Amino acid sequence: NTITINCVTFPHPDTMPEQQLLKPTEWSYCDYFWADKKDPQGNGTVAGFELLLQKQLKGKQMQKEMSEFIRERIKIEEEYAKNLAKLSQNSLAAQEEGSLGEAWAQVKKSLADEAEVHLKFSAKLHSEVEKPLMNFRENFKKDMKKCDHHIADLRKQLASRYASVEKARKALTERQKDLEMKTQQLEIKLSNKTEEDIKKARRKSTQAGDDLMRCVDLYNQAQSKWFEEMVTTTLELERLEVERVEMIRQHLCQYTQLRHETDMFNQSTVEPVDQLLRKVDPAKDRELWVREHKTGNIRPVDME
Amino acid sequence: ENTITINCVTFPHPDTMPEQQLLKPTEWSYCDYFWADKKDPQGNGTVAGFELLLQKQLKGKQMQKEMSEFIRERIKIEEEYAKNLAKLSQNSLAAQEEGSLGEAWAQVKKSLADEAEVHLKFSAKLHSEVEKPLMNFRENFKKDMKKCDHHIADLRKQLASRYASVEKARKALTERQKDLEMKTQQLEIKLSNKTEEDIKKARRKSTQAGDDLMRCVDLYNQAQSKWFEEMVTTTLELERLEVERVEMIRQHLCQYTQLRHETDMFNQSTVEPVDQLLRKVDPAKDRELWVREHKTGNIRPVDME
């Protein structure tokens, strides 16, 4: 008829009529985690809900690790900027003069500019990617545990109710036996003091049957409460996982855009050097130099 | 005395000053402004203008060397950057993220390696097209100038020698003149028979000394003219060399600029695949992938009995 596994009742075996999915054909949490998972390695049994929770937790661990990756990237960029900046301060070939000297100086200064660009890049990574990836929903900690214990407690109630039901089944079958006995005693010899006990047996028996019906009802109520809770919570988990994926995609797109625009900014720093390289004139340089270093403008002549 | 001699080279006195026009009277050329020696701003020492030109050449070579080394530093930096980027690209952080999100993440990591390739290639091209050409330009120039130095220097030595002779000759002249001018006095006070022949000897040797002077002056002027023409051609050569130096340096710095540009373009192009996969991320499909593998069963509970 039906079957009970871990205090929960399912159809049996069956090739039964029914059953349409709750959300076709999304692979929803609310449709595929009713049975409990028996680990095949022999470490106990857990509700499917536990699988959902572990999946969520793992998701958060993942976004943490991503954040860490970005932190490492930031560190690399800072070292790069550091080196570029120090090299920009280098005094190599500083005594080169003229428009050539100007262009060279501008090359070094351009190095400084690149360094600043990459530093700001790393800062933007920090504010707009690393911290958001990390600091996303810090408060899942005991909250999700709370949810867990909630569902678990509902399962507790279910188990209790099942126990009560089984007890009722015992009492019922027992009383039935007692009545079917005492009616045989009425078949052998009433009497009249024996008879009202035969009536009382019927009383207590039917009473026990009503007790059974009651216990079964309360069981079904417990399972239905557990059911509705299961549904709402699992859908909540589905939504949360989806939006996790969404925010991560968003911030990775952020990373890509920052990379792109940072490389544009970086490329734009050699243009000043280019402007000066075009203005380089060997003749003008030479004349400037001769103007500052001449020994005199008189030519030799013959003696006497 | 209408000329003046400083450091064995003869210039007008000035006067006042004559005039004389420049060889290249619109340019501030090497051939017009480095005949005189530069006076030490303190002592009684001088150095030739030509030496100033030579020193300028040497400085030029030193400077292209230093630029080359600067580029070496840049190469080292880029290489360290590339190394770090490569190692981080190999990191296994969040490797257990699965589905299209996991794949997009994987490409995020790989793009770092791609950047590494770009920057490494950048540094390599810096080495090939910028550093080495700067360093290896005119390798024997150090000695090519040294030889050049000796050339002009040797001429100047000769000039000095000639000048010395001239001065020596003047000594001999002034002496002989006096020797004559003072033997006529001996005849003026106590004339005798040997003194006349001593005046004859004196006059002879005197005119001879004068002829020696004239000759020495001629050879001096000859030496100075040789020094002059050679000086001119050589200074024009150094002018040309400095020009071609500046031009090659400009060329290779432009090369540097080009490498910068294309390196930043290549670098920018590495996030495009990441973008492409990032657009393909689907939460629903991901979920389907996971649930298909982790479902416990799709049968719902029912009522007892």
Residue numbers in the entry:
A (entry chain B): 172 to 475
B (entry chain A): 171 to 475
What does the paper say about this structure?
In this study, we show that GAS7 plays a critical role in phagocytic cup formation in macrophages. Crystallographic, electron microscopic, biochemical and cellular localization analyses revealed that the GAS7 F-BAR domain possesses unique hydrophilic loops that contribute to two-dimensional sheet formation of GAS7 on flat membranes of phagocytotic cup, indicating that the sheet-like assembly of GAS7 is essential for phagocytosis. In addition to the F-BAR domain, GAS7b possess a WW domain, and GAS7cb and GAS7c possesses a WW and an SH3 domain, while GAS7d contains only the F-BAR domain. The structures of the F-BAR domains in both crystals were almost identical, with a root mean square deviation of 1.2 Å. The GAS7 F-BAR domain forms a helical-bundle dimer with a shallow concave curvature, which is one of the flattest curvatures amongst the known F-BAR domains.
